[PDB]
Amino acid sequence: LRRDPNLPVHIRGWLHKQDSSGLRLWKRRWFVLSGHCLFYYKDSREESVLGSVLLPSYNIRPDGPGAPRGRRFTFTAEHPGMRTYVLAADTLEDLRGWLRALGRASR
Q1: Domain count, the chain
Q2: Residue 93: domain span
Q3: Which residues contact 89 (CB under 8 A, 6 or more apart)?
Q4: How many CA atoms does the CB half-sphere of 51 hold within 13 Å?
Q5: Is beta strand 26-34 parallel, antiparallel or unpaired with respect to 37-41?
Q6: Distance between CA 104 and CA 107 in Å, rounded?
Q7: Any idea what the CATH number is for the domain that residue 5 is in?
Q8: Is 53 buried (19+), middle (13-18) or exposed (0-12) by CB count in 10 A?
């Protein structure tokens, strides 16, 4: 997907993303929610999209108490047959803003 430079941004910032190789590593990426799409980049320069998600078909849920994935404040964006995004915020307030924005984009 392509980002429209003109479109307002609902939220952006760092999140850790778990990889999908099966070794379950994390990599810090810079995410941007614009329109109903999530984009991520190498860093906050927002130069060259490295990945993107069309959110209207996705469901996004927090992973809940207990740091089950080995870090706090994780949440999962999923839809069967589509790539799962496993994400971690740095704080609770961070988590709140992201879950709000992703919920609106997916509804």
Answers
A1: 1
A2: 1-107
A3: 15, 73, 74, 75, 95, 98
A4: 15
A5: antiparallel
A6: 5
A7: 2.30.29.30
A8: buried
